[PDB]
Ligand SMILES: CC/C(=C(\c1ccc(O)cc1)c1ccc(OCCN(C)C)cc1)c1ccccc1
Ligand SMILES: CC/C(=C(\c1ccc(O)cc1)c1ccc(OCCN(C)C)cc1)c1ccccc1
């Protein structure tokens with residue numbers, strides 16, 4: 027069939043952002059980090075603008091729109107890179123002009139963190155994750171981000187369903203051959219959350235280094 | 236009218252109640268509360284493991300993979316146990332029938348953040364009216380779905396997740412026709428369980444190195 | 460009749476200061492914290508003017524005036540909210556237009572730190588603490604704030620001594636039933652220091668977590 | 683003087699020695715190792731000591747543990763502060779372990795020992811006397827401001843009784859300074875401040 | 891232990 | 903700047 031909510035997310039999808047790594051600065055630890063920070067920083071801006079285009083999101087209270095975003099942001103970044111990395115082997119595509127393999131990830135000291143990010147890539151590869159599912163899953167993570175101080179819980183739950191129902195209907199139509207594909211998709215979020223938390227902690231930890 | 240064979244199996248394999256059994260002689264304190272949960276956890280693990288063997292697929296897996304799944308999900312299974320036991324209570328956590336922690340007792344043990352997070356899991360499943368059949372199946376899936384970075388037979392573990400998932404989706408298809416999306420709703424709680432587990436595992440290692448524990452036992456020893 | 464210094468301090472006592480929470484901003488962790496940092500910054504200023512009136516304090520070097528302030532500022536701020544809260548139950552009056560209960564302390568991520576301040580409220584509630592004792596205690600908390608960078612130690616001790624005298628004298632006149640009241644008062648500072656130190660830590664601690672400069676960009680973007 | 687001050691004077695533990703291993707070359711580890719071994723053994727006599735404070739033993743065990751759990755570092759540091767009184771810029775952890783600026787540098791403890799010296803410096807100026815030291819130690823145990831007190835009234839009473847002893851001591855033996863008792867009580871914030879530094883410093887170099 | 895418990899408990 | 907503020911004040 028055609029699904030209203032996925033087609034909107036498809037056109038809501040942001041445009042390619044580039045890391046523009048400074049060629050004047052000599053290859054190093056700080057560099058990789060200075061670039062990813064500025065990259066993430068620039069990504070967030072269009073992620074917020076993106077969030078408004080999610081059906082139902084903009085009818086939430088500003089307090090809740092924030093809470094969901096204050097919770098989810100890293101998850102949305104990480105799923106981002108995970109997706110761009112699907113057709114690659116043991117490499118991560120933070121942007122087209124910044125691709126990290128084992129030995130670069132050694133220099134930045136992100137081996138453990140990127141290896142985690144690759145566990146997520148490794149999984150979605152198996153499933154043949156498709157863009158229609160990527161976008162719908164980003165949305166779901168934002169909505170299911172388990173924030174502690176939601177004002178309107180019902181409104182946020184209803185948003186969760188609308189997105190869930192979208193995934194469900196999509197999979198019912200495009201993947202009848204696996205009646206549990208949708209569930210399988212939702213079962214990959216706990217890793218995304220796990221990995222999200224590490225990244226955050228890792229980020230705040232290195233604000234002393 | 237007939238249930239799922241795996242769900243039914245999981246229900247008979249569900250371990251009997253375990254008692255916390257606090258020492259009445261030891262005066263109430265942070266360390267008591269901790270001490271009491273540690274020994275509880277340790278006996279619960281032993282049965283949790285015994286339980287694992289009864290999950291279909293599990294024992295067929297290599298001993299290293301069995302180890303690795305338990306190694307990743309133990310704390311999710313412990314925590315999901317207290318949560319279930321807590322469903323028909325208000326702002327209290329039933330670690331055991333003889334060990335229920337309300338706010339005050341949590342303030343005394345420095346588990347105010349930790350238990351608040353666990354109460355968050357309780358609040359959500361309360362909403363859905365989580366049912367035993369669902370709890371035991373969810374425990375199985377938490378184990379199967381535990382994302383260990385160290386798996387040997389990846390396809391076999393996936394096959395374990397697929398079976399258990401299918402049992403949930405079938406129970407939820409027969410017993411909850413009014414909610415075609417109940418299984419996914421259930422699965423959508425997994426991440427909070429994961430987040431919460433990691434919190435817990437953090438807190439625990441975080442207080443060994445903050446070794447207040449043996450100091451307390453030594454005070455009592457001298458003072459009594 | 461009254462002690463001259465104590466009298467001087469009651470008139471030295473600054474006027475109320477309001478938090479003036481932005482009503483357009485939605486209620487959240489960072490709002491709370493935003494609101495309290497602005498408040499503090501303004502109270503600091505009047506706390507600094509206030510200290511000038513303390514007898515002796517102007518006669519110190521500018522370096523010493525600065526040292527005592529750098530050490531006692533958070534202690535004064537807290538003794539403030541603590542006095543303002545005495546008449547209330549489980550609530551902290553940061554200002555008349557900003558009052559935190561258990562529920563809001565949770566929103567702001569201040570639960571642990573607010574309870575510590577409420578622990579200070581509880582004690583002074585029990586001793587039916589009076590404005591005369593509050594104002595003089597702020598002066599003492601400043602004079603006795605134990606900075607390492609002092610130029611003139613004798614001069615700072617002499618200020619502790621005079622302020623101490625004023626307290627003893629006031630307790631002798633106003634509380635003859637309890638000849639230990641002055642000491643009891645003095646015995647609450649160790650908690651004020653401890654608690655002050657928590658406040659200070661928590662703050663430098665959330666400058667690193669920098670979720671405030673996040674939240675600000677989320678506010679701007681989402682509108 | 684006073685029945686309670688006398689009782690505290692006699693309760694005072696006997697000296698304890700650091701007995702560092704002389705075979706082990708000097709380093710950061712050894713210093714920290716020797717000081718851990720000393721505190722541990724001091725803590726045992728310290729605990730025995732609290733039982734001999736008037737009123738301590740009538741509180742509930744929960745309360746007794748609580749106050750010690752709160753106060754233990756203050757009582758340790760106050761100890762070294764007192765043994766250090768007749769020395770110049772040096773900390774007498776025990777007769778056979780005395781740390782000067784250089785040794786303090788090698789332990790990674792310059793900032794902390796400095797702060798401890800700041801206490802010594804204050805008490806030197808007042809000419810702190812053993813009777814004041816031991817009553818103050820007592821008070822530090824009892825004014826320890828734990829959150830989880832069971833009997834607030836009984837613990838309050840223990841504060842009041844020990845205060846009254848400080849009061850009476852300074853009233854009879856130090857009438858020339860009508861505020862000496864208050865002066866003494868005003869050194870406690872720096873103790874609690876410094877005691878927190880040390881506890882935080884200890885758990886810091888556990889990780890490290 | 892955790893490692894020890896899991897191991898011991900699977901073993902026998 | 904905490905120090906800054908305090909200085910700024912005792913100037914004005
Ligand atoms: C792991 C890659 C990464 C970030 C990242 C992930 C995906 C992506 O598409 C782009 C970047 C990352 C880095 C920094 C960061 O901080 C942003 C917060 N502002 C306040 C600087 C967020 C993510 C990172 C996270 C923590 C430490 C080091 C690097
Ligand atoms: C939150 C409750 C809890 C534990 C718990 C949870 C559920 C339950 O049924 C029983 C206990 C807990 C406590 C200790 C613990 O340590 C295990 C170490 N053993 C395996 C050596 C694990 C969980 C705990 C976890 C971390 C710190 C403090 C307490």
Ligand SMILES: CC/C(=C(\c1ccc(O)cc1)c1ccc(OCCN(C)C)cc1)c1ccccc1
Pocket residue numbers: 492495496497498499500502503536537539540553572658659661662903904
């Ligand atoms: C405890 C409330 C509080 C402050 C406060 C206390 C009493 C009062 O009357 C007003 C405010 C607080 C907050 C910030 C602060 O520093 C301001 C930053 N400037 C000085 C650069 C000081 C106190 C605070 C302190 C640390 C972290 C978070 C909040």
Ligand SMILES: CC/C(=C(\c1ccc(O)cc1)c1ccc(OCCN(C)C)cc1)c1ccccc1
Pocket residue numbers: 450714717718720721722724758759761762775791794880881883884
């Ligand atoms: C200030 C010297 C000191 C200790 C000390 C203080 C007074 C005294 O009379 C003797 C020693 C010290 C060191 C360790 C310590 O922990 C003991 C508790 N066990 C569980 C290790 C306590 C005090 C110390 C504390 C922390 C880190 C490094 C040094």
